[PDB]
């Protein structure tokens, strides 16, 4: 069994309405982890129990190099705690914001790891639904880690559909902005937006007003920098096709279609999951508590129904 007192609480890494993520050290081992702490009373009051349960189930039942892994889960009378592997490289959002744009080769590396993770999730009948820069982290070696599984839908195989209006506004697929149901191709739209951001340095569609933002997503044609390679233009046009049936990855073979795109001609998809490729960037931390790839906004801040939640990993 594991409790709150089994850990040192070092630094705030991230924060939302429904929880905080703290860098912790397990006292007995000296190992560092990221602990997500939620308030039961808030989760219950605001009807976030289903999302929290889904997040728990996905974490408990997935194992993939490019998905955040759960070490322990436990609870108290008023709190739920996920102890996850710590990604010391921060969010892809941090890095892209600093660099403005990635090379196509660097974008291809991250893109391949994301495709691998999405292929894996789809193979487990899970649709992720919230691909975005803030939910993609870099681990200590520079590999992608997908985070934030609360918006996943489980039990979606083949062309099964979903109804919930959810995601992140800027990343919503056009079909999600129509009435009725949508399928797993929404994840390839999401990949398209992040790939577009990585190679073009901006969102493909943006307005501060959601009504106008949603009009752009539904109605506006994407634009490309003149100098983007033809293969990059082709990939982005394919992933950001508005009709999910015409979208790259939208057909019956799903991730296969994306993997076979000429943009990824140089990728050995078997090497990808085995982590044989040297990543394009390794976080240059000087210690395990060096939080330089997290915003000072968080790290400076001082720190002072659920039946099947508890979990201890077999690793």
């Amino acid at each position: 069994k594991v409790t709150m007192n089994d850990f040192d609480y070092l630094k705030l890494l991230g924060k939302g309405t429904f929880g905080k993520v703290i860098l912790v050290r397990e006292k007995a081992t000296g190992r560092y982890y990221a602990m997500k702490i939620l308030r039961k009373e808030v989760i219950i009051a605001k009807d976030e129990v289903a999302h929290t349960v889904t997040e728990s189930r996905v974490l408990q039942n997935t194992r993939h190099p490019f998905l955040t892994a759960l070490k322990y889960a436990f609870q108290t009378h008023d709190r739920l705690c996920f102890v996850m592997e710590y990604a010391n490289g921060g969010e892809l959002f941090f890095h892209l914001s600093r660099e403005r744009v990635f090379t196509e080769e660097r974008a291809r590396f991250y893109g391949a790891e994301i495709v691998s993770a999405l292929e894996y999730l789809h193979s487990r009948d899970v649709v992720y639904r919230d691909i975005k820069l803030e939910n993609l982290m870099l681990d200590k070696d520079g590999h992608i880690k997908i985070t934030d599984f609360g918006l996943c839908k489980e039990g979606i195989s083949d062309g099964a559909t979903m109804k919930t209006f959810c995601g992140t506004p800027e990343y919503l697929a056009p079909e999600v902005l129509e009435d009725n149901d949508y399928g797993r191709a929404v994840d390839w739209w999401g990949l398209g937006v992040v790939m577009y951001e990585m190679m073009c340095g901006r969102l493909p569609f943006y307005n501060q007003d959601h009504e106008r933002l949603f009009e752009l997503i539904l109605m506006e044609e994407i634009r490309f920098p003149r100098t983007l390679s033809p293969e990059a233009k082709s990939l982005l046009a394919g992933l950001l096709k508005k009709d999910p049936k015409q979208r790259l990855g939208g057909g019956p073979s799903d991730a296969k279609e994306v993997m076979e795109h000429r943009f990824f001609l140089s990728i050995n998809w078997q090497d990808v999951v085995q982590k044989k490729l040297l990543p394009p960037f390794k976080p240059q931390v000087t210690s395990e508590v060096d939080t330089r790839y997290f915003d000072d906004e968080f790290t400076a801040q001082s720190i002072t129904m659920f039946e099947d939640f508890d979990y201890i990993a077999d690793w």
Partner: peptide, 10 residues
């Protein structure tokens, strides 16, 4: 560097 975004569900 765009503003940070926020996930939602309705």
């Amino acid at each position: 560097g765009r503003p940070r975004t926020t996930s939602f569900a309705e």
